[PDB]
Amino acid sequence: MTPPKTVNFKMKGVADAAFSHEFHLGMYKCNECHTKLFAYKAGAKRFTMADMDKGKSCGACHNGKDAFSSASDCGKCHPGLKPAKLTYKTSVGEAYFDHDIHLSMFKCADCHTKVFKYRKGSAPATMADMEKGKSCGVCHNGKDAFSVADDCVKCHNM
Ligand code: HEC
Ligand code: HEC
Ligand code: HEC
Ligand code: HEC
Ligand code: HEC
Ligand code: HEC
């Protein structure tokens, strides 16, 4: 018999999530999660990220105190939701967006989903759009973060 295996959560329309028994077993024993938090049966009891904020499922520990909050860092549990360096193909060459640099100042919620969706290429914007406050322009306005009005080389390889 082998230890419980890594669990895969299949969601239609959403990037799958994963749970590592091995990693958590380095900290807990079976009864700390079974059966108050999760059952031992193949019986589903599907939860939402909301239920988690309400202390259920992964949220029982991933609350910002016991373990990192399940409200952010989606890429830690959702492999497909991993923030990466983005490259845009524009009419004047490539433009880039580095998540890592921004993650040293903001949390996922600061941009997702009010400003951007977790999907590149969704709502394309022109620099003019940005100058009016859209896309990067929401912050890069020369008052909060540096403006998009000049120093194109900051984001462009022209
Ligand atoms: C919380 C940190 C856990 C600890 C410690 C252990 N398990 Fe676990 N287990 C946990 C989760 C999040 C899940 C997924 C539940 C889901 O909604 O799909 C599981 C699943 C299992 C299963 C599979 C049962 C099934 O869904 O049909 C088994 C058989 C199981 N866990 C066994 C098990 C044992 C023996 C543990 C101690 C060695 C153990 N788990 C610890 C969360 C956690
Ligand atoms: C690990 C602690 C997680 C973090 C952090 C995030 N999510 Fe998650 N998500 C996780 C699991 C195990 C599941 C499935 C739970 C189940 O019982 O099946 C999910 C599910 C979702 C869903 C579908 C349900 C819903 O609330 O709509 C979505 C849309 C989803 N997760 C999105 C998401 C985002 C955007 C996150 C960061 C802001 C995020 N998750 C973090 C586990 C974890
Ligand atoms: C309490 C019994 C927990 C439950 C239930 C779940 N997790 Fe957990 N998780 C817990 C701790 C104490 C930690 C370590 C501290 C930290 O915040 O990192 C974690 C860590 C993880 C991680 C990151 C691991 C790493 O490489 O550092 C992930 C990806 C993770 N946990 C996912 C996860 C999911 C998907 C859960 C619900 C299915 C879940 N955890 C439950 C404590 C507990
Ligand atoms: C604003 C400063 C951001 C923060 C903070 C985070 N993300 Fe992000 N993300 C941002 C942009 C501009 C885009 C492009 C959207 C578009 O319309 O093209 C994205 C895109 C993503 C995606 C999909 C592409 C990818 O990077 O793989 C994901 C999966 C994503 N972002 C995840 C993510 C997570 C988990 C964050 C916090 C840890 C996060 N983003 C923060 C801008 C910003
Ligand atoms: C980062 C803060 C930027 C600065 C500074 C400038 N641009 Fe930009 N530009 C950036 C991105 C990420 C994108 C793609 C946006 C998308 O939704 O796809 C672009 C795109 C353009 C485009 C194509 C779209 C259009 O406006 O027609 C052009 C022609 C362009 N950018 C030119 C440009 C010039 C000349 C700049 C300095 C005056 C400039 N950009 C700055 C991000 C950023
Ligand atoms: C507010 C939530 C922001 C969004 C949305 C985007 N950026 Fe940003 N960016 C922001 C800050 C606060 C900073 C730090 C510097 C400052 O102006 O105070 C940055 C920094 C960058 C950089 C790197 C600058 C450097 O370290 O030299 C670049 C090139 C940049 N940002 C580009 C960029 C693009 C293309 C964005 C839209 C896809 C984007 N940022 C959104 C704040 C915010």
Tab-separated table of C-alpha atoms and ligand atoms in Angstrom:
chain	number	residue	atom	x	y	z
A	1	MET	CA	0.000	0.000	0.000
A	2	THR	CA	1.239	3.498	-0.906
A	3	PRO	CA	0.666	6.795	0.954
A	4	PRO	CA	-2.296	8.878	-0.155
A	5	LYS	CA	-1.368	10.404	-3.522
A	6	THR	CA	-1.315	13.953	-4.830
A	7	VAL	CA	-4.859	15.160	-5.394
A	8	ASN	CA	-6.046	16.838	-8.592
A	9	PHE	CA	-9.112	19.084	-8.559
A	10	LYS	CA	-10.774	19.230	-11.971
A	11	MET	CA	-12.843	22.353	-12.604
A	12	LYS	CA	-14.487	23.085	-15.931
A	13	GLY	CA	-13.681	26.612	-17.039
A	14	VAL	CA	-11.111	26.964	-14.248
A	15	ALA	CA	-7.444	25.978	-14.155
A	16	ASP	CA	-7.029	22.761	-12.168
A	17	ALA	CA	-5.721	22.830	-8.611
A	18	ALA	CA	-3.449	20.361	-6.828
A	19	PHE	CA	-2.872	19.220	-3.245
A	20	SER	CA	0.273	17.427	-2.103
A	21	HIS	CA	-0.237	14.841	0.594
A	22	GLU	CA	3.499	14.279	0.908
A	23	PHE	CA	4.254	17.952	1.567
A	24	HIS	CA	1.495	18.361	4.174
A	25	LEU	CA	2.320	15.022	5.798
A	26	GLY	CA	5.619	16.609	6.751
A	27	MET	CA	3.571	18.773	9.113
A	28	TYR	CA	0.385	16.854	9.918
A	29	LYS	CA	-1.031	13.445	10.757
A	30	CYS	CA	-4.149	12.087	9.023
A	31	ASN	CA	-6.731	13.081	11.690
A	32	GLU	CA	-5.822	16.747	11.506
A	33	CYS	CA	-7.679	16.945	8.186
A	34	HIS	CA	-9.687	13.728	8.035
A	35	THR	CA	-12.644	13.741	8.490
A	36	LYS	CA	-13.502	17.192	9.868
A	37	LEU	CA	-11.973	19.044	6.909
A	38	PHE	CA	-12.107	16.338	4.229
A	39	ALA	CA	-13.635	12.878	3.951
A	40	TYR	CA	-11.838	9.631	3.140
A	41	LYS	CA	-14.491	8.723	0.566
A	42	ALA	CA	-14.703	9.368	-3.166
A	43	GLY	CA	-17.789	11.352	-2.231
A	44	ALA	CA	-17.459	14.885	-3.562
A	45	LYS	CA	-18.253	18.027	-1.568
A	46	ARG	CA	-16.909	20.593	-4.046
A	47	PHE	CA	-15.948	23.972	-2.568
A	48	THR	CA	-15.381	27.480	-3.901
A	49	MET	CA	-12.656	29.996	-3.128
A	50	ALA	CA	-15.401	31.823	-1.242
A	51	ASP	CA	-16.141	28.905	1.064
A	52	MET	CA	-12.400	28.834	1.689
A	53	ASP	CA	-12.396	32.447	2.862
A	54	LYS	CA	-15.166	31.343	5.198
A	55	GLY	CA	-12.771	28.859	6.776
A	56	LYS	CA	-13.638	25.700	4.850
A	57	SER	CA	-11.508	23.302	2.788
A	58	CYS	CA	-7.990	24.699	2.238
A	59	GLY	CA	-9.249	27.826	3.987
A	60	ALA	CA	-9.176	26.144	7.385
A	61	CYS	CA	-5.421	26.847	7.410
A	62	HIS	CA	-4.723	29.024	4.382
A	63	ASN	CA	-5.988	32.095	6.172
A	64	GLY	CA	-2.916	34.299	6.319
A	65	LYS	CA	-2.124	33.163	9.870
A	66	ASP	CA	-1.639	29.390	9.924
A	67	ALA	CA	-0.640	29.216	6.253
A	68	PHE	CA	-0.544	31.698	3.360
A	69	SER	CA	-3.972	33.113	2.465
A	70	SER	CA	-5.989	31.263	-0.172
A	71	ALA	CA	-7.192	34.652	-1.416
A	72	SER	CA	-3.916	35.308	-3.224
A	73	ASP	CA	-0.998	33.488	-4.885
A	74	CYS	CA	-3.301	31.439	-7.102
A	75	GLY	CA	-0.289	29.940	-8.848
A	76	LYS	CA	0.794	28.077	-5.726
A	77	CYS	CA	-2.245	25.796	-5.835
A	78	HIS	CA	-3.322	26.442	-9.441
A	79	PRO	CA	-0.369	25.481	-11.690
A	80	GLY	CA	-2.095	27.099	-14.663
A	81	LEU	CA	-2.606	30.359	-12.772
A	82	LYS	CA	1.144	30.886	-12.417
A	83	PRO	CA	2.183	34.526	-12.979
A	84	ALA	CA	4.905	34.773	-15.629
A	85	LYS	CA	6.755	37.296	-17.783
A	86	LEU	CA	4.430	38.382	-20.592
A	87	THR	CA	5.389	39.405	-24.132
A	88	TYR	CA	3.057	41.388	-26.391
A	89	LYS	CA	3.445	41.595	-30.149
A	90	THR	CA	2.779	45.201	-31.099
A	91	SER	CA	2.871	47.224	-34.299
A	92	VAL	CA	6.228	48.637	-33.172
A	93	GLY	CA	7.831	45.502	-31.804
A	94	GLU	CA	7.645	43.569	-28.562
A	95	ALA	CA	6.326	45.057	-25.337
A	96	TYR	CA	6.757	43.259	-22.029
A	97	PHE	CA	5.187	42.847	-18.617
A	98	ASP	CA	7.119	41.324	-15.719
A	99	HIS	CA	4.915	39.886	-12.961
A	100	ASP	CA	7.791	39.308	-10.544
A	101	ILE	CA	8.800	42.964	-10.425
A	102	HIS	CA	5.210	44.013	-9.720
A	103	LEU	CA	4.611	41.220	-7.211
A	104	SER	CA	7.218	42.871	-4.984
A	105	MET	CA	4.730	45.737	-4.558
A	106	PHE	CA	1.257	44.317	-5.163
A	107	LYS	CA	-0.928	41.277	-4.555
A	108	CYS	CA	-2.911	39.421	-7.220
A	109	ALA	CA	-6.083	41.254	-6.162
A	110	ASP	CA	-4.575	44.666	-6.899
A	111	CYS	CA	-4.904	43.999	-10.647
A	112	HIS	CA	-7.070	40.906	-10.980
A	113	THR	CA	-9.924	41.037	-11.872
A	114	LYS	CA	-10.906	44.728	-11.883
A	115	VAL	CA	-8.001	45.690	-14.142
A	116	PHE	CA	-6.903	42.463	-15.833
A	117	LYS	CA	-8.266	38.960	-16.217
A	118	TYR	CA	-6.081	35.918	-15.591
A	119	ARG	CA	-5.831	35.582	-19.371
A	120	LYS	CA	-3.432	37.435	-21.652
A	121	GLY	CA	-4.758	39.101	-24.801
A	122	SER	CA	-8.264	39.427	-23.369
A	123	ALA	CA	-8.884	43.195	-23.547
A	124	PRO	CA	-6.179	44.753	-25.781
A	125	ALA	CA	-5.463	48.456	-25.325
A	126	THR	CA	-3.771	51.213	-27.303
A	127	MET	CA	-1.340	53.655	-25.692
A	128	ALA	CA	-4.070	56.273	-26.093
A	129	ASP	CA	-6.349	53.996	-24.056
A	130	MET	CA	-3.598	53.783	-21.465
A	131	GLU	CA	-3.184	57.553	-21.412
A	132	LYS	CA	-6.879	57.801	-20.501
A	133	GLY	CA	-6.384	55.489	-17.524
A	134	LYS	CA	-6.970	52.025	-19.023
A	135	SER	CA	-4.768	48.916	-18.773
A	136	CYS	CA	-1.274	49.793	-17.457
A	137	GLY	CA	-2.433	53.411	-17.550
A	138	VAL	CA	-4.519	52.789	-14.424
A	139	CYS	CA	-1.267	53.205	-12.489
A	140	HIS	CA	1.257	54.369	-15.079
A	141	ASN	CA	-0.093	57.901	-15.311
A	142	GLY	CA	2.886	59.915	-14.156
A	143	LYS	CA	1.183	60.663	-10.825
A	144	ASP	CA	1.053	57.216	-9.207
A	145	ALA	CA	3.513	55.122	-11.233
A	146	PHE	CA	5.592	56.594	-14.097
A	147	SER	CA	3.606	57.583	-17.189
A	148	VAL	CA	3.212	55.761	-20.475
A	149	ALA	CA	3.585	59.094	-22.321
A	150	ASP	CA	7.330	58.710	-22.911
A	151	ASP	CA	10.419	56.606	-22.156
A	152	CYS	CA	8.907	53.884	-24.342
A	153	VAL	CA	12.030	51.763	-23.892
A	154	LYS	CA	10.921	51.060	-20.320
A	155	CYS	CA	8.374	48.603	-21.721
A	156	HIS	CA	9.318	48.389	-25.395
A	157	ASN	CA	12.155	46.922	-27.389
A	158	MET	CA	11.903	49.311	-30.336
B	1	HEC	C1	-4.795	18.034	5.290
B	1	HEC	C2	-3.520	18.853	5.386
B	1	HEC	C3	-4.547	16.548	4.946
B	1	HEC	C4	-3.823	15.625	5.649
B	1	HEC	C5	-2.844	15.858	6.820
B	1	HEC	C6	-4.143	14.335	5.058
B	1	HEC	N1	-5.036	14.461	3.991
B	1	HEC	FE1	-5.830	13.057	2.859
B	1	HEC	N2	-6.726	14.431	1.763
B	1	HEC	C7	-6.736	15.802	1.953
B	1	HEC	C8	-7.410	16.481	0.868
B	1	HEC	C9	-7.461	17.997	0.611
B	1	HEC	C10	-7.908	15.529	0.035
B	1	HEC	C11	-8.735	15.814	-1.222
B	1	HEC	C12	-10.227	15.732	-0.901
B	1	HEC	C13	-11.106	16.072	-2.093
B	1	HEC	O1	-12.004	16.925	-1.937
B	1	HEC	O2	-10.904	15.490	-3.183
B	1	HEC	C14	-7.508	14.252	0.590
B	1	HEC	C15	-7.871	13.012	0.075
B	1	HEC	C16	-7.508	11.784	0.678
B	1	HEC	C17	-7.894	10.483	0.174
B	1	HEC	C18	-8.700	10.208	-1.090
B	1	HEC	C19	-10.115	9.806	-0.706
B	1	HEC	C20	-11.133	10.130	-1.784
B	1	HEC	O3	-11.345	11.333	-2.051
B	1	HEC	O4	-11.717	9.186	-2.366
B	1	HEC	C21	-7.455	9.566	1.052
B	1	HEC	C22	-7.701	8.066	0.911
B	1	HEC	C23	-6.741	10.289	2.080
B	1	HEC	N3	-6.756	11.654	1.838
B	1	HEC	C24	-5.967	9.667	3.046
B	1	HEC	C25	-5.105	10.329	3.917
B	1	HEC	C26	-4.280	9.658	4.914
B	1	HEC	C27	-4.184	8.140	5.162
B	1	HEC	C28	-3.586	10.633	5.576
B	1	HEC	C29	-2.509	10.450	6.649
B	1	HEC	C30	-1.331	9.649	6.116
B	1	HEC	C31	-4.002	11.893	4.996
B	1	HEC	N4	-4.932	11.707	3.957
B	1	HEC	C32	-3.631	13.136	5.524
B	1	HEC	C33	-6.091	16.460	2.988
B	1	HEC	C34	-5.264	15.831	3.912
B	2	HEC	C1	-4.641	26.651	-2.468
B	2	HEC	C2	-4.545	27.088	-1.021
B	2	HEC	C3	-5.500	27.578	-3.329
B	2	HEC	C4	-5.273	28.919	-3.582
B	2	HEC	C5	-4.280	29.857	-2.884
B	2	HEC	C6	-6.219	29.289	-4.614
B	2	HEC	N1	-7.073	28.225	-4.957
B	2	HEC	FE1	-8.565	28.171	-6.237
B	2	HEC	N2	-9.019	26.313	-5.713
B	2	HEC	C7	-8.310	25.483	-4.860
B	2	HEC	C8	-8.952	24.165	-4.772
B	2	HEC	C9	-8.445	22.916	-4.059
B	2	HEC	C10	-10.079	24.231	-5.524
B	2	HEC	C11	-11.130	23.143	-5.684
B	2	HEC	C12	-11.912	22.973	-4.394
B	2	HEC	C13	-12.939	21.864	-4.481
B	2	HEC	O1	-13.546	21.534	-3.442
B	2	HEC	O2	-13.141	21.323	-5.586
B	2	HEC	C14	-10.130	25.565	-6.092
B	2	HEC	C15	-11.173	26.048	-6.872
B	2	HEC	C16	-11.158	27.300	-7.499
B	2	HEC	C17	-12.190	27.772	-8.407
B	2	HEC	C18	-13.544	27.106	-8.639
B	2	HEC	C19	-14.537	27.411	-7.529
B	2	HEC	C20	-14.831	28.893	-7.414
B	2	HEC	O3	-14.705	29.449	-6.296
B	2	HEC	O4	-15.189	29.501	-8.447
B	2	HEC	C21	-11.759	28.939	-8.954
B	2	HEC	C22	-12.552	29.822	-9.925
B	2	HEC	C23	-10.432	29.193	-8.389
B	2	HEC	N3	-10.100	28.207	-7.443
B	2	HEC	C24	-9.695	30.369	-8.597
B	2	HEC	C25	-8.589	30.768	-7.822
B	2	HEC	C26	-7.978	32.105	-7.876
B	2	HEC	C27	-8.274	33.204	-8.896
B	2	HEC	C28	-7.109	32.195	-6.835
B	2	HEC	C29	-6.232	33.383	-6.407
B	2	HEC	C30	-6.920	34.746	-6.368
B	2	HEC	C31	-7.161	30.907	-6.167
B	2	HEC	N4	-8.079	30.038	-6.761
B	2	HEC	C32	-6.279	30.558	-5.159
B	2	HEC	C33	-7.206	25.888	-4.120
B	2	HEC	C34	-6.638	27.161	-4.154
B	3	HEC	C1	-3.908	22.780	7.641
B	3	HEC	C2	-4.164	21.384	8.205
B	3	HEC	C3	-3.763	22.815	6.125
B	3	HEC	C4	-4.675	22.397	5.212
B	3	HEC	C5	-6.044	21.780	5.510
B	3	HEC	C6	-4.119	22.696	3.904
B	3	HEC	N1	-2.860	23.269	4.003
B	3	HEC	FE1	-1.638	23.765	2.536
B	3	HEC	N2	-0.313	24.341	3.845
B	3	HEC	C7	-0.384	24.294	5.233
B	3	HEC	C8	0.826	24.787	5.826
B	3	HEC	C9	1.157	24.971	7.309
B	3	HEC	C10	1.651	25.150	4.820
B	3	HEC	C11	3.074	25.663	5.014
B	3	HEC	C12	3.228	27.158	5.248
B	3	HEC	C13	2.917	27.987	4.017
B	3	HEC	O1	2.004	28.832	4.098
B	3	HEC	O2	3.584	27.800	2.973
B	3	HEC	C14	0.955	24.882	3.603
B	3	HEC	C15	1.540	25.048	2.344
B	3	HEC	C16	0.925	24.716	1.155
B	3	HEC	C17	1.485	25.036	-0.158
B	3	HEC	C18	2.840	25.679	-0.477
B	3	HEC	C19	3.954	24.663	-0.243
B	3	HEC	C20	5.344	25.236	-0.466
B	3	HEC	O3	5.990	24.859	-1.469
B	3	HEC	O4	5.792	26.058	0.361
B	3	HEC	C21	0.537	24.682	-1.045
B	3	HEC	C22	0.679	24.678	-2.559
B	3	HEC	C23	-0.615	24.228	-0.296
B	3	HEC	N3	-0.370	24.234	1.068
B	3	HEC	C24	-1.811	23.869	-0.876
B	3	HEC	C25	-2.926	23.451	-0.154
B	3	HEC	C26	-4.174	23.074	-0.776
B	3	HEC	C27	-4.463	23.027	-2.281
B	3	HEC	C28	-5.021	22.722	0.248
B	3	HEC	C29	-6.502	22.356	0.132
B	3	HEC	C30	-6.741	21.195	-0.799
B	3	HEC	C31	-4.274	22.821	1.471
B	3	HEC	N4	-2.990	23.312	1.245
B	3	HEC	C32	-4.797	22.493	2.722
B	3	HEC	C33	-1.478	23.858	5.964
B	3	HEC	C34	-2.641	23.368	5.375
B	4	HEC	C1	-0.756	44.129	-11.801
B	4	HEC	C2	0.434	44.948	-11.356
B	4	HEC	C3	-0.637	42.604	-11.676
B	4	HEC	C4	-0.477	41.894	-10.541
B	4	HEC	C5	-0.098	42.461	-9.177
B	4	HEC	C6	-0.671	40.499	-10.908
B	4	HEC	N1	-0.916	40.356	-12.270
B	4	HEC	FE1	-1.327	38.750	-13.338
B	4	HEC	N2	-1.493	39.761	-15.005
B	4	HEC	C7	-1.310	41.131	-15.134
B	4	HEC	C8	-1.443	41.532	-16.523
B	4	HEC	C9	-1.160	42.900	-17.123
B	4	HEC	C10	-1.800	40.428	-17.230
B	4	HEC	C11	-2.170	40.461	-18.709
B	4	HEC	C12	-3.665	40.426	-18.976
B	4	HEC	C13	-4.005	40.689	-20.434
B	4	HEC	O1	-5.130	41.161	-20.704
B	4	HEC	O2	-3.157	40.414	-21.312
B	4	HEC	C14	-1.796	39.317	-16.305
B	4	HEC	C15	-2.023	37.993	-16.660
B	4	HEC	C16	-1.982	36.939	-15.735
B	4	HEC	C17	-2.199	35.535	-16.079
B	4	HEC	C18	-2.302	34.847	-17.461
B	4	HEC	C19	-0.968	34.924	-18.194
B	4	HEC	C20	0.198	34.430	-17.347
B	4	HEC	O3	0.856	35.266	-16.684
B	4	HEC	O4	0.449	33.207	-17.327
B	4	HEC	C21	-2.130	34.860	-14.911
B	4	HEC	C22	-2.156	33.339	-14.787
B	4	HEC	C23	-1.878	35.823	-13.853
B	4	HEC	N3	-1.762	37.103	-14.360
B	4	HEC	C24	-1.693	35.453	-12.508
B	4	HEC	C25	-1.422	36.330	-11.482
B	4	HEC	C26	-1.273	35.926	-10.096
B	4	HEC	C27	-1.548	34.535	-9.511
B	4	HEC	C28	-0.903	37.067	-9.413
B	4	HEC	C29	-0.444	37.214	-7.965
B	4	HEC	C30	0.491	36.141	-7.404
B	4	HEC	C31	-0.926	38.141	-10.354
B	4	HEC	N4	-1.238	37.708	-11.637
B	4	HEC	C32	-0.651	39.450	-10.006
B	4	HEC	C33	-1.029	42.015	-14.082
B	4	HEC	C34	-0.856	41.659	-12.752
B	5	HEC	C1	4.751	50.381	-20.197
B	5	HEC	C2	4.290	51.206	-19.009
B	5	HEC	C3	4.586	51.063	-21.541
B	5	HEC	C4	5.130	52.249	-21.937
B	5	HEC	C5	5.988	53.160	-21.071
B	5	HEC	C6	4.805	52.413	-23.341
B	5	HEC	N1	4.073	51.334	-23.820
B	5	HEC	FE1	3.408	51.007	-25.639
B	5	HEC	N2	2.644	49.304	-25.082
B	5	HEC	C7	2.746	48.678	-23.849
B	5	HEC	C8	2.044	47.406	-23.868
B	5	HEC	C9	2.060	46.355	-22.774
B	5	HEC	C10	1.435	47.278	-25.076
B	5	HEC	C11	0.426	46.217	-25.524
B	5	HEC	C12	-0.926	46.472	-24.880
B	5	HEC	C13	-1.999	45.513	-25.348
B	5	HEC	O1	-3.107	45.538	-24.772
B	5	HEC	O2	-1.745	44.737	-26.294
B	5	HEC	C14	1.833	48.438	-25.827
B	5	HEC	C15	1.377	48.694	-27.090
B	5	HEC	C16	1.750	49.796	-27.839
B	5	HEC	C17	1.377	49.939	-29.224
B	5	HEC	C18	0.337	49.067	-29.947
B	5	HEC	C19	-1.071	49.468	-29.562
B	5	HEC	C20	-1.403	50.859	-30.028
B	5	HEC	O3	-1.373	51.796	-29.194
B	5	HEC	O4	-1.676	51.018	-31.236
B	5	HEC	C21	2.151	50.932	-29.729
B	5	HEC	C22	2.144	51.440	-31.167
B	5	HEC	C23	3.000	51.406	-28.623
B	5	HEC	N3	2.701	50.720	-27.454
B	5	HEC	C24	3.852	52.496	-28.690
B	5	HEC	C25	4.432	53.096	-27.562
B	5	HEC	C26	5.284	54.280	-27.609
B	5	HEC	C27	5.730	55.018	-28.858
B	5	HEC	C28	5.594	54.601	-26.327
B	5	HEC	C29	6.413	55.798	-25.864
B	5	HEC	C30	5.862	57.144	-26.313
B	5	HEC	C31	4.949	53.597	-25.471
B	5	HEC	N4	4.253	52.663	-26.234
B	5	HEC	C32	5.177	53.492	-24.109
B	5	HEC	C33	3.315	49.254	-22.710
B	5	HEC	C34	3.922	50.501	-22.702
B	6	HEC	C1	-0.563	49.508	-10.630
B	6	HEC	C2	-1.381	48.462	-9.896
B	6	HEC	C3	0.272	49.002	-11.811
B	6	HEC	C4	-0.143	48.348	-12.911
B	6	HEC	C5	-1.582	47.992	-13.239
B	6	HEC	C6	1.044	48.161	-13.761
B	6	HEC	N1	2.180	48.702	-13.168
B	6	HEC	FE1	4.026	48.738	-13.793
B	6	HEC	N2	4.660	49.481	-12.151
B	6	HEC	C7	3.882	49.948	-11.103
B	6	HEC	C8	4.711	50.451	-10.036
B	6	HEC	C9	4.252	51.049	-8.723
B	6	HEC	C10	5.985	50.318	-10.443
B	6	HEC	C11	7.237	50.740	-9.681
B	6	HEC	C12	7.916	51.998	-10.200
B	6	HEC	C13	7.053	53.232	-10.054
B	6	HEC	O1	6.684	53.824	-11.086
B	6	HEC	O2	6.745	53.607	-8.902
B	6	HEC	C14	5.960	49.695	-11.744
B	6	HEC	C15	7.101	49.384	-12.482
B	6	HEC	C16	7.057	48.898	-13.783
B	6	HEC	C17	8.237	48.728	-14.645
B	6	HEC	C18	9.687	48.651	-14.177
B	6	HEC	C19	10.300	49.988	-13.767
B	6	HEC	C20	11.694	49.840	-13.162
B	6	HEC	O3	11.835	49.099	-12.158
B	6	HEC	O4	12.643	50.470	-13.684
B	6	HEC	C21	7.772	48.527	-15.901
B	6	HEC	C22	8.619	48.402	-17.170
B	6	HEC	C23	6.314	48.469	-15.797
B	6	HEC	N3	5.888	48.696	-14.481
B	6	HEC	C24	5.475	48.100	-16.847
B	6	HEC	C25	4.114	47.854	-16.718
B	6	HEC	C26	3.253	47.417	-17.818
B	6	HEC	C27	3.638	47.091	-19.259
B	6	HEC	C28	2.014	47.295	-17.303
B	6	HEC	C29	0.737	46.973	-18.075
B	6	HEC	C30	0.655	45.580	-18.691
B	6	HEC	C31	2.104	47.581	-15.878
B	6	HEC	N4	3.392	47.970	-15.518
B	6	HEC	C32	0.992	47.642	-15.047
B	6	HEC	C33	2.487	49.862	-11.038
B	6	HEC	C34	1.713	49.237	-11.981
